[PDB]
Design an enzyme around this catalytic site. Structure first.
Site, PDB file in Angstrom:
ATOM      1  N   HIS A  97     -39.973  14.058  63.210  1.00 25.42           N
ATOM      2  CA  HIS A  97     -40.332  14.966  64.291  1.00 25.42           C
ATOM      3  C   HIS A  97     -39.151  15.567  65.060  1.00 25.42           C
ATOM      4  N   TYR A 139     -36.834  19.437  66.781  1.00 23.73           N
ATOM      5  CA  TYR A 139     -36.065  19.711  67.997  1.00 23.73           C
ATOM      6  C   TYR A 139     -34.588  19.920  67.713  1.00 23.73           C
ATOM      7  N   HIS A 193     -49.446  26.411  63.127  1.00 25.14           N
ATOM      8  CA  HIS A 193     -48.623  25.945  64.222  1.00 25.14           C
ATOM      9  C   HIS A 193     -47.125  26.164  63.939  1.00 25.14           C
ATOM     10  N   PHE A 194     -46.613  25.630  62.836  1.00 24.92           N
ATOM     11  CA  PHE A 194     -45.156  25.571  62.681  1.00 24.92           C
ATOM     12  C   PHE A 194     -44.443  26.860  62.227  1.00 24.92           C
ATOM     13  N   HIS A 195     -45.175  27.809  61.649  1.00 23.69           N
ATOM     14  CA  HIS A 195     -44.581  29.128  61.400  1.00 23.69           C
ATOM     15  C   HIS A 195     -44.354  29.905  62.701  1.00 23.69           C
ATOM     16  N   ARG A 210     -53.870  22.440  53.637  1.00 23.06           N
ATOM     17  CA  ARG A 210     -52.495  22.889  53.429  1.00 23.06           C
ATOM     18  C   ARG A 210     -51.969  22.375  52.100  1.00 23.06           C
ATOM     19  N   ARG A 211     -50.877  22.971  51.625  1.00 22.12           N
ATOM     20  CA  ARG A 211     -50.192  22.507  50.405  1.00 22.12           C
ATOM     21  C   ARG A 211     -51.063  22.633  49.154  1.00 22.12           C
TER      22      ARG A 211
HETATM   23  C1  HAS Z   1     -39.229  24.480  65.650  1.00 23.45           C
HETATM   24  C2  HAS Z   1     -40.278  23.582  65.048  1.00 23.45           C
HETATM   25  C3  HAS Z   1     -41.135  22.795  65.685  1.00 23.45           C
HETATM   26  C4  HAS Z   1     -41.577  22.794  67.125  1.00 23.45           C
HETATM   27  C5  HAS Z   1     -40.865  23.401  68.309  1.00 23.45           C
HETATM   28  C6  HAS Z   1     -42.717  22.089  67.224  1.00 23.45           C
HETATM   29  C7  HAS Z   1     -43.417  21.824  68.525  1.00 23.45           C
HETATM   30  C8  HAS Z   1     -44.442  20.996  68.718  1.00 23.45           C
HETATM   31  N1  HAS Z   1     -45.078  20.322  67.713  1.00 23.45           N
HETATM   32 FE1  HAS Z   1     -44.956  20.638  65.700  1.00 23.45          FE
HETATM   33  N2  HAS Z   1     -46.458  19.421  65.409  1.00 23.45           N
HETATM   34  C9  HAS Z   1     -46.964  18.429  66.373  1.00 23.45           C
HETATM   35  C10 HAS Z   1     -46.560  18.487  67.816  1.00 23.45           C
HETATM   36  C11 HAS Z   1     -45.939  19.513  68.362  1.00 23.45           C
HETATM   37  C12 HAS Z   1     -45.940  19.751  69.833  1.00 23.45           C
HETATM   38  C13 HAS Z   1     -46.603  18.910  70.903  1.00 23.45           C
HETATM   39  C14 HAS Z   1     -44.973  20.626  70.079  1.00 23.45           C
HETATM   40  C15 HAS Z   1     -44.488  20.949  71.489  1.00 23.45           C
HETATM   41  O1  HAS Z   1     -43.104  20.611  71.625  1.00 23.45           O
HETATM   42  C16 HAS Z   1     -44.745  22.383  72.006  1.00 23.45           C
HETATM   43  C17 HAS Z   1     -44.163  22.732  73.388  1.00 23.45           C
HETATM   44  C18 HAS Z   1     -44.180  24.211  73.746  1.00 23.45           C
HETATM   45  C19 HAS Z   1     -44.904  24.783  74.712  1.00 23.45           C
HETATM   46  C20 HAS Z   1     -45.830  24.027  75.641  1.00 23.45           C
HETATM   47  C21 HAS Z   1     -44.859  26.285  74.925  1.00 23.45           C
HETATM   48  C22 HAS Z   1     -43.855  26.806  75.955  1.00 23.45           C
HETATM   49  C23 HAS Z   1     -43.609  28.281  75.680  1.00 23.45           C
HETATM   50  C24 HAS Z   1     -42.445  28.929  75.647  1.00 23.45           C
HETATM   51  C25 HAS Z   1     -41.108  28.244  75.766  1.00 23.45           C
HETATM   52  C26 HAS Z   1     -42.423  30.428  75.493  1.00 23.45           C
HETATM   53  C27 HAS Z   1     -42.567  31.224  76.791  1.00 23.45           C
HETATM   54  C28 HAS Z   1     -42.292  32.696  76.551  1.00 23.45           C
HETATM   55  C29 HAS Z   1     -41.418  33.429  77.225  1.00 23.45           C
HETATM   56  C30 HAS Z   1     -40.613  32.892  78.393  1.00 23.45           C
HETATM   57  C31 HAS Z   1     -41.213  34.877  76.840  1.00 23.45           C
HETATM   58  C32 HAS Z   1     -41.725  35.861  77.895  1.00 23.45           C
HETATM   59  C33 HAS Z   1     -41.056  37.213  77.810  1.00 23.45           C
HETATM   60  C34 HAS Z   1     -41.668  38.377  78.007  1.00 23.45           C
HETATM   61  C35 HAS Z   1     -41.224  39.633  77.301  1.00 23.45           C
HETATM   62  C36 HAS Z   1     -42.848  38.569  78.929  1.00 23.45           C
HETATM   63  C37 HAS Z   1     -47.883  17.432  65.692  1.00 23.45           C
HETATM   64  C38 HAS Z   1     -48.715  16.396  66.372  1.00 23.45           C
HETATM   65  O2  HAS Z   1     -48.450  15.815  67.412  1.00 23.45           O
HETATM   66  C39 HAS Z   1     -47.816  17.651  64.369  1.00 23.45           C
HETATM   67  C40 HAS Z   1     -48.630  16.949  63.303  1.00 23.45           C
HETATM   68  C41 HAS Z   1     -50.074  17.446  63.139  1.00 23.45           C
HETATM   69  C42 HAS Z   1     -50.614  16.996  61.806  1.00 23.45           C
HETATM   70  O3  HAS Z   1     -51.900  16.724  61.651  1.00 23.45           O
HETATM   71  O4  HAS Z   1     -49.810  16.903  60.904  1.00 23.45           O
HETATM   72  C43 HAS Z   1     -46.844  18.791  64.132  1.00 23.45           C
HETATM   73  C44 HAS Z   1     -46.254  19.249  62.823  1.00 23.45           C
HETATM   74  C45 HAS Z   1     -45.364  20.238  62.703  1.00 23.45           C
HETATM   75  C46 HAS Z   1     -44.767  20.562  61.366  1.00 23.45           C
HETATM   76  C47 HAS Z   1     -45.249  20.054  60.034  1.00 23.45           C
HETATM   77  C48 HAS Z   1     -44.956  18.590  59.744  1.00 23.45           C
HETATM   78  C49 HAS Z   1     -45.307  18.399  58.298  1.00 23.45           C
HETATM   79  O5  HAS Z   1     -44.794  19.187  57.519  1.00 23.45           O
HETATM   80  O6  HAS Z   1     -46.166  17.437  57.937  1.00 23.45           O
HETATM   81  C50 HAS Z   1     -43.673  21.263  61.577  1.00 23.45           C
HETATM   82  C51 HAS Z   1     -42.511  21.486  60.632  1.00 23.45           C
HETATM   83  C52 HAS Z   1     -43.632  21.462  63.049  1.00 23.45           C
HETATM   84  C53 HAS Z   1     -42.679  22.180  63.609  1.00 23.45           C
HETATM   85  C54 HAS Z   1     -42.332  22.176  65.059  1.00 23.45           C
HETATM   86  N3  HAS Z   1     -43.178  21.600  66.062  1.00 23.45           N
HETATM   87  N4  HAS Z   1     -44.631  20.815  63.697  1.00 23.45           N
HETATM   88  C1  HEM Z   2     -41.467  35.653  54.528  1.00 24.20           C
HETATM   89  C2  HEM Z   2     -41.778  34.577  55.536  1.00 24.20           C
HETATM   90  C3  HEM Z   2     -42.450  33.494  55.165  1.00 24.20           C
HETATM   91  C4  HEM Z   2     -43.842  33.405  54.628  1.00 24.20           C
HETATM   92  C5  HEM Z   2     -44.698  34.589  54.242  1.00 24.20           C
HETATM   93  C6  HEM Z   2     -44.189  32.117  54.664  1.00 24.20           C
HETATM   94  C7  HEM Z   2     -45.547  31.620  54.251  1.00 24.20           C
HETATM   95  C8  HEM Z   2     -45.839  30.329  54.148  1.00 24.20           C
HETATM   96  C9  HEM Z   2     -47.209  29.781  53.878  1.00 24.20           C
HETATM   97  C10 HEM Z   2     -48.419  30.612  53.510  1.00 24.20           C
HETATM   98  C11 HEM Z   2     -47.122  28.458  53.728  1.00 24.20           C
HETATM   99  C12 HEM Z   2     -48.253  27.489  53.429  1.00 24.20           C
HETATM  100  C13 HEM Z   2     -48.295  27.167  51.938  1.00 24.20           C
HETATM  101  C14 HEM Z   2     -49.122  25.919  51.743  1.00 24.20           C
HETATM  102  O1  HEM Z   2     -49.561  25.259  52.806  1.00 24.20           O
HETATM  103  O2  HEM Z   2     -49.399  25.511  50.622  1.00 24.20           O
HETATM  104  C15 HEM Z   2     -45.730  28.065  54.121  1.00 24.20           C
HETATM  105  C16 HEM Z   2     -45.234  26.642  54.188  1.00 24.20           C
HETATM  106  C17 HEM Z   2     -44.049  26.323  54.674  1.00 24.20           C
HETATM  107  N1  HEM Z   2     -43.192  27.123  55.341  1.00 24.20           N
HETATM  108 FE1  HEM Z   2     -43.134  29.157  55.168  1.00 24.20          FE
HETATM  109  N2  HEM Z   2     -43.128  31.347  55.026  1.00 24.20           N
HETATM  110  C18 HEM Z   2     -42.144  32.094  55.560  1.00 24.20           C
HETATM  111  C19 HEM Z   2     -40.972  31.747  56.054  1.00 24.20           C
HETATM  112  C20 HEM Z   2     -40.680  30.373  56.524  1.00 24.20           C
HETATM  113  C21 HEM Z   2     -39.610  30.028  57.229  1.00 24.20           C
HETATM  114  C22 HEM Z   2     -38.535  30.938  57.795  1.00 24.20           C
HETATM  115  C23 HEM Z   2     -39.751  28.577  57.468  1.00 24.20           C
HETATM  116  C24 HEM Z   2     -38.659  27.712  57.990  1.00 24.20           C
HETATM  117  C25 HEM Z   2     -37.816  28.152  58.913  1.00 24.20           C
HETATM  118  C26 HEM Z   2     -40.840  28.195  56.811  1.00 24.20           C
HETATM  119  C27 HEM Z   2     -41.243  26.771  56.666  1.00 24.20           C
HETATM  120  C28 HEM Z   2     -42.208  26.365  55.860  1.00 24.20           C
HETATM  121  C29 HEM Z   2     -42.423  24.939  55.437  1.00 24.20           C
HETATM  122  C30 HEM Z   2     -41.788  23.721  56.073  1.00 24.20           C
HETATM  123  C31 HEM Z   2     -43.547  24.917  54.724  1.00 24.20           C
HETATM  124  C32 HEM Z   2     -44.387  23.686  54.448  1.00 24.20           C
HETATM  125  C33 HEM Z   2     -44.017  23.105  53.078  1.00 24.20           C
HETATM  126  C34 HEM Z   2     -44.858  21.883  52.755  1.00 24.20           C
HETATM  127  O3  HEM Z   2     -45.976  21.650  53.424  1.00 24.20           O
HETATM  128  O4  HEM Z   2     -44.525  21.102  51.882  1.00 24.20           O
HETATM  129  N3  HEM Z   2     -41.467  29.306  56.327  1.00 24.20           N
HETATM  130  N4  HEM Z   2     -45.022  29.300  54.434  1.00 24.20           N
HETATM  131  O1  LIG Z   3     -43.095  18.371  64.384  1.00 23.78           O
HETATM  132  O2  LIG Z   3     -44.055  18.570  65.543  1.00 23.78           O
HETATM  133 CU   LIG Z   4     -43.695  15.945  65.200  1.00 16.51          CU
END
Ligand code: HAS
Ligand code: HEM
Ligand SMILES: [O-][O-]
Ligand SMILES: [Cu+2]
Ligand SMILES: CCCCCCCC/C=C/CCCCCCCC(=O)OC[C@H](O)CO
Ligand SMILES: CCCCCCCC/C=C\CCCCCCCC(=O)OC[C@H](O)CO
Ligand SMILES: CCCCCCCC/C=C\CCCCCCCC(=O)OC[C@H](O)CO
Ligand SMILES: CCCCCCCC/C=C\CCCCCCCC(=O)OC[C@H](O)CO
Ligand SMILES: CCCCCCCC/C=C\CCCCCCCC(=O)OC[C@H](O)CO
Ligand SMILES: CCCCCCCC/C=C\CCCCCCCC(=O)OC[C@H](O)CO
Ligand SMILES: CCCCCCCC/C=C\CCCCCCCC(=O)OC[C@H](O)CO
Ligand SMILES: CCCCCCCC/C=C\CCCCCCCC(=O)OC[C@H](O)CO
Ligand SMILES: CCCCCCCC/C=C\CCCCCCCC(=O)OC[C@H](O)CO
Ligand SMILES: CCCCCCCC/C=C\CCCCCCCC(=O)OC[C@H](O)CO
Ligand SMILES: CCCCCCCC/C=C\CCCCCCCC(=O)OC[C@H](O)CO
Ligand SMILES: CCCCCCCC/C=C\CCCCCCCC(=O)OC[C@H](O)CO
Ligand SMILES: CCCCCCCC/C=C\CCCCCCCC(=O)OC[C@H](O)CO
Ligand SMILES: CCCCCCCC/C=C\CCCCCCCC(=O)OC[C@H](O)CO
Ligand SMILES: CCCCCCCC/C=C\CCCCCCCC(=O)OC[C@H](O)CO
Ligand code: CUA
EC number: 7.1.1.9
Lengths: 166, 31, 554
Positions: free
Chosen positions: C225, C229, C376-378, C441-442
């Site tokens: 996880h 970050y 979520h993660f895209h 997924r996957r």
């Molecule tokens: C960069 C990548 C990652 C971030 C960041 C991220 C954040 C969170 N995640 Fe996640 N996620 C999970 C919990 C969270 C929660 C609580 C947050 C939190 O940290 C989110 C906090 C963020 C906020 C509360 C939003 C604040 C908003 C902001 C900062 C923007 C404000 C906008 C502005 C200021 C712009 C305004 C400007 C103008 C122009 C008006 C959980 C479960 O508890 C799973 C597992 C679920 C399952 O069944 O597998 C999970 C699984 C994933 C996976 C897949 C894992 C796998 O492959 O099996 C990926 C890679 C991923 C990526 C990321 N995750 N997450």
């Molecule tokens: C042209 C932009 C991209 C497209 C259209 C795209 C689309 C996709 C989609 C449809 C899946 C789901 C496939 C599945 O669940 O079987 C996927 C999975 C994934 N994507 Fe991307 N993707 C993009 C770029 C990225 C980028 C920039 C990241 C990382 C920075 C990323 C990270 C991942 C990872 C971690 C997986 C999950 C692999 C796994 O579950 O084993 N993607 N993407």
């Molecule tokens: O990784 O949430």
């Molecule tokens: Cu996590």
């Protein structure tokens, strides 16, 4: 201006930080609640219960699928499910509506999903371990089991079937 | 007051509440 | 180049950046096809003509995930979180060590790629046992990641060297960020290193017949996880310390920013059971604990959201914006380096909203392992992180190479960014929506075209997003090489100062800042929190190991 802008920005950010924490806290209260309902049955039992994947189709409760379904309470069935490449035994799984179904699921090869479509049953099935989960089916009929953990080239077509009888 | 900064966190709260209450409903519909 | 003689760190960083983006491009080739797949449209035949070494959907999904989510993001974090602090401090990072880390990465990537390209390691970027890849996948992954330990040494070295010259001064902002960043990464890395060394490598070299799937998954999600970050905070370093300048304003709170980061050092690692909610042999009380700890770690971003939005608003007001809306249109929307991060923040709103849903213990049973999760993660990493790294090309490339961005190249930049943002938005809808419809997924689901009839609507989003992102990716490729391999080279660019923002006046919490700078102490707190959060569970798992034979099912 800047001195002011800063003061006002920081005052209000503290408002936000308190309210958000609040909302997070309420979610925690609401999760807690679910823990106290019957809907928490789908959380796995966190007991370790180790089996031998290499012999599980030869001995034990997964060895004879037509006997996977045992009545273990006056309104309770335990069901021994094998998840494997690529399918689920038995097929179908036949349980009665209204009854509490304890699923005990395992795998002989790799990891699978056990995601019962239409329900909150979603459990990872790890070889070497028995996953245990509890659900009561309220509505009769046919639920699809979906594997949702990648398990090799046959992943996309691995499905099962639970029939809930009236 | 930082009027815009707050609008942002309004949207963010609403998005969160909609998501979370949404999925809560779903969880229970499936329970 | 005389410039590289005085600033050899510009060249190392440039190397980390290019490799990262190459990995990005190659990894990202597979995305549109995957998007079309989640739209129930099978274009894999077409792909296997273009790329004949590709044997299946799942080999492509491995490459995609390993290359985008592990390689490019890490290369990026190594680039940003060394070079930025190094420029803030105006000190030279240890150049021997910096080159050791790049070659470590490069070497490790190449070793791991061999078996990936040869279809010997089609496990996903999660590589859960007992699915069993080639030893070279594990070796080369291990060496790729360990490259970061050198990075950690480097920035600590900078830090202390500075403190020595500067006793009784607090740590400067970017460097305090980078230091808590890297210390956070060291704790978090331990899980995977542990797993690779105790289990994955013995196993794959044939030293031991089986691995315990549960123990591997637990050790994986230790690292697993906070690795996100790790991905995120490089972007956040820019969003906080650079974007405010790009937007025409200042960072409105140094201490608020330090606090976000400190909270990440404490709360990033003790949370991993939020990936094991559907796992057996993990006690429900420990899942609730990690659930609660996960809701906490959402606070630094809830915080970030306000700090950053307020900074953005302050900029828009400086630049003449009147009204509740006018500060938005007053911002430098013709500047790619401004647009990219801001669009990424926008998508981050639904992103974090889905993260918060995921982290609730029982709510995860609704969405676990469905298309919701990729949804979520895209938004989180494929959007906010990638968009950030993307828009830095327009400021950080010139800084590292002396190569100028033409006005033409700027316009292409805007187009890519927007098309990437929008494409990601469209896909996030198809995915979340499909997820709620129980699509897994996957999964190569276009190969079972009648399996998910209720998902007809979101599918058209996934198709659309597919073609939209293909165009964005094509354009990104063209553009990157158009600038990389460009003719002109104005060295007074490489000598320009990085566009660091000022901090707004005035008075602040000196004692807060001082407390927060007690970094040794926070490091240990964080580490205690891990022992507490993981210890008791891991002691039982290890005390009852049940290894199983590995499988190849591709
Ligand atoms: C960069 C990548 C990652 C971030 C960041 C991220 C954040 C969170 N995640 Fe996640 N996620 C999970 C919990 C969270 C929660 C609580 C947050 C939190 O940290 C989110 C906090 C963020 C906020 C509360 C939003 C604040 C908003 C902001 C900062 C923007 C404000 C906008 C502005 C200021 C712009 C305004 C400007 C103008 C122009 C008006 C959980 C479960 O508890 C799973 C597992 C679920 C399952 O069944 O597998 C999970 C699984 C994933 C996976 C897949 C894992 C796998 O492959 O099996 C990926 C890679 C991923 C990526 C990321 N995750 N997450
Ligand atoms: C042209 C932009 C991209 C497209 C259209 C795209 C689309 C996709 C989609 C449809 C899946 C789901 C496939 C599945 O669940 O079987 C996927 C999975 C994934 N994507 Fe991307 N993707 C993009 C770029 C990225 C980028 C920039 C990241 C990382 C920075 C990323 C990270 C991942 C990872 C971690 C997986 C999950 C692999 C796994 O579950 O084993 N993607 N993407
Ligand atoms: O990784 O949430
Ligand atoms: Cu996590
Ligand atoms: C800037 C880049 C953004 C990209 C935006 C591009 C516009 C999307 C499509 C427009 C025409 C509508 C297409 C509909 C016509 C054919 C669809 C069809 O019938 O599908 C064929 C077949 O089913 C498949 O295998
Ligand atoms: C279910 C509940 C309904 C949801 C509906 C959306 C709720 C909006 C949420 C947060 C606004 C946070 C900002 C709170 C402002 C705090 C006040 C403050 O601190 O102001 C001090 C200032 O000095 C005065 O002059
Ligand atoms: C400043 C104001 C201070 C006061 C703030 C208080 C906030 C109250 C919010 C939510 C309470 C949650 C109520 C818990 C009840 C949950 C039960 C439920 O939703 O049940 C549905 C399901 O059908 C059953 O099985
Ligand atoms: C912008 C985002 C828009 C998103 C729009 C969301 C649409 C999904 C809504 C509800 C799914 C809830 C799942 C409810 C499952 C009920 C299925 C059921 O009960 O049927 C199976 C049973 O076997 C019969 O015999
Ligand atoms: C810009 C990109 C953003 C991407 C946005 C992601 C879309 C998901 C949004 C909200 C989900 C809310 C939950 C949906 C709840 C619908 C069903 C409901 O309300 O539940 C009762 C029903 O009976 C049960 O079967
Ligand atoms: C295979 C391993 C060879 C490792 C390749 C080592 C090449 C590193 C050369 C390098 O970049 O270091 C500068 C060196 O002092 C010269 O210029
Ligand atoms: C780079 C580091 C990779 C680690 C490789 C080897 C470490 C030494 C491990 C030595 C192997 C011991 C395995 C063993 O003792 O196996 C017992 C068996 O499980 C019951 O009969
Ligand atoms: C340094 C570079 C390579 C180290 C040598 C690594 C050599 C590992 C060879 C062991 C091997 O290939 O073992 C296969 C075994 O049968 C499992 O399936
Ligand atoms: C600072 C970290 C917070 C400290 C900890 C926060 C409080 C959680 C405590 C107990 C949860 C009890 C879980 C009981 C759920 C078991 C349900 C079950 O067994 O269902 C089948
Ligand atoms: C279904 C999802 C697909 C649709 C996705 C939509 C999501 C949000 C889209 C755009 C955000 C725009 C935010 C505000 C943009 C500001 C641009 C502006 O104000 O322009 C100034 C102009 O250049 C004079 O200087
Ligand atoms: C600032 C960046 C943009 C952030 C803004 C995006 C936030 C998305 C929130 C909600 C969209 C969800 C759509 C509404 C859910 C539909 C519910 C529905 O109809 O679901 C079927 C249900 O079963 C009844 O039939
Ligand atoms: C239903 C609605 C249609 C589905 C979406 C079609 C997809 C892409 C359309 C093209 C969008 C191109 C956006 C380019 C914006 C841009 O680059 O403008 C910069 C601006 O001046 C300041 O940011
Ligand atoms: C945001 C950008 C909007 C993009 C496309 C509009 C969506 C139109 C999607 C309409 C679904 C059409 C469809 O596939 O029909 C469903 C089913 O087949 C009926 O029988
Ligand atoms: C020129 C810039 C704006 C133009 C952007 C387009 C506007 C978005 C609307 C629809 C996208 C259509 C793409 C989907 C076409 C694929 C056909 C398909 O897969 O159709 C499924 C159908 O349900 C078979 O049963
Ligand atoms: C050595 C491991 C580094 C982990 C401890 C870092 C905290 C620390 O030692 O900080 C004091 C510094 O050396 C003086 O300014
Ligand atoms: Cu079994 Cu996927």
């Amino acid at each position: 201006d800047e001195h002011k802008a800063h003061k006002a920005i920081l005052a209000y950010e503290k408002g936000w930080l308190a309210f958000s924490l609040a909302m997070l806290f309420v979610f925690i209260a609401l999760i807690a609640y679910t823990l106290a309902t019957h809907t928490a049955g789908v959380i796995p039992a966190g007991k370790l219960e180790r089996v031998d994947p290499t012999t599980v189709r030869q001995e034990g409760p997964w060895a004879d699928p037509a006997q996977a379904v045992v009545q273990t309470g006056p309104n309770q069935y335990t069901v021994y499910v094998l998840a494997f490449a690529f399918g689920y035994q038995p097929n179908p799984i036949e349980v009665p509506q209204g009854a509490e179904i304890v699923f005990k699921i395992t795998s002989p090869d790799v990891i699978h999903g056990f995601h019962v479509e239409g329900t909150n049953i979603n459990v990872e099935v790890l070889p070497g371990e028995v996953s245990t989960v509890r659900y009561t089916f309220k509505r009769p009929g046919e639920y699809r089991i979906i594997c949702n953990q990648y398990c090799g080239l046959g992943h996309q077509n691995m499905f099962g079937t639970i029939v809930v009888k009236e | 007051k930082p009027k815009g900064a707050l609008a942002v966190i309004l949207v963010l709260t609403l998005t969160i509440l909609v998501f979370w209450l949404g999925v809560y409903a779903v969880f229970f519909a499936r329970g | 180049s005389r410039v590289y003689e005085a600033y050899p760190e510009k060249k190392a960083t440039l190397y980390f950046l290019v490799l990262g983006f190459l990995a990005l491009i190659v990894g990202s080739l597979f995305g549109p096809f995957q998007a079309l797949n989640y739209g129930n449209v099978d274009a894999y035949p077409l792909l296997k003509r273009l790329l004949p070494f590709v044997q299946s959907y799942y080999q492509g999904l491995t490459l995609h995930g390993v290359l985008n989510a592990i390689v490019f993001t890490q290369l990026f974090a190594q680039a940003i979180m060394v070079y930025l602090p190094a420029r803030e401090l105006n000190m030279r990072p240890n150049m021997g060590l910096m080159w050791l880390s790049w070659w470590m990465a490069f070497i490790g990537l190449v070793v791991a790629a061999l078996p990936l390209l040869a279809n010997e390691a089609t496990v996903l970027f999660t590589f859960y046992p007992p699915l069993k890849g080639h030893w070279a996948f594990y070796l080369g992954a291990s060496v790729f990641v360990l490259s970061t330990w050198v990075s950690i040494y480097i920035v600590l070295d900078l830090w202390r060297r500075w403190k020595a010259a500067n006793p009784g001064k607090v740590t400067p902002l970017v460097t305090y960020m980078a230091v808590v960043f890297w210390l956070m990464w060291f704790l978090a890395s331990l899980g995977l290193v542990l797993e690779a060394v105790l289990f994955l490598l013995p196993w794959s070299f044939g030293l031991v017949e089986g691995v315990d799937p549960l123990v591997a998954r637990t050790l994986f999600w230790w690292t697993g996880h906070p690795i996100v970050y790790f991905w995120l905070l490089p972007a956040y370093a820019i969003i906080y310390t650079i974007l405010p300048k790009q937007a025409g304003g200042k960072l409105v709170s140094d201490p608020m920013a330090r606090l976000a980061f400190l909270l990440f050092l404490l709360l990033s690692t003790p949370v991993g059971f939020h990936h094991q909610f559907a796992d057996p042999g993990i006690d429900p009380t420990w899942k609730m604990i990690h659930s609660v700890l996960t809701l906490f770690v959402a606070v630094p971003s809830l915080m970030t959201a306000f700090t950053v939005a307020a900074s953005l608003e302050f900029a828009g007001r400086l630049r003449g914006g009147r009204g509740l809306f006018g500060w938005i249109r007053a911002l430098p929307w013709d500047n790619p380096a401004f647009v990219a991060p801001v669009l990424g923040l926008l998508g981050f709103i639904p992103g974090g909203a889905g993260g918060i849903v995921n982290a609730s213990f029982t709510l995860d049973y609704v969405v676990h392992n469905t298309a919701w999760v990729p949804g979520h993660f895209h938004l989180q990493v494929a959007s906010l992180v990638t968009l950030t790294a993307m828009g830095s090309l327009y400021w950080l490339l010139p800084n590292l190479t002396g190569k100028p961005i033409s006005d033409a190249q700027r316009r292409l930049g805007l187009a890519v960014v927007w098309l990437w943002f929008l494409g990601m938005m469209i896909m996030a809808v198809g995915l979340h929506w499909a997820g709620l419809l129980n699509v897994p997924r996957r999964a190569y689901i276009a190969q079972v075209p009648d399996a998910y009839p209720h998902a007809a609507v979101p599918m058209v989003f996934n198709v659309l997003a597919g073609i939209v992102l293909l165009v964005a990716l094509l354009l990104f490729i063209y553009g990157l090489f158009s600038v990389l391999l460009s003719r002109e080279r104005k060295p007074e660019l490489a000598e320009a100062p990085l566009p660091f923002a000022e901090v707004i006046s005035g008075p602040e919490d000196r004692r807060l800042v001082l407390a927060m700078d007690r970094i040794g102490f926070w490091f240990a707190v964080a580490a205690i929190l891990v022992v507490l959060a993981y210890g008791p569970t891991l002691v039982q798992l290890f005390g009852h190991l049940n290894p199983v034979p590995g499988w190849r099912l591709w």
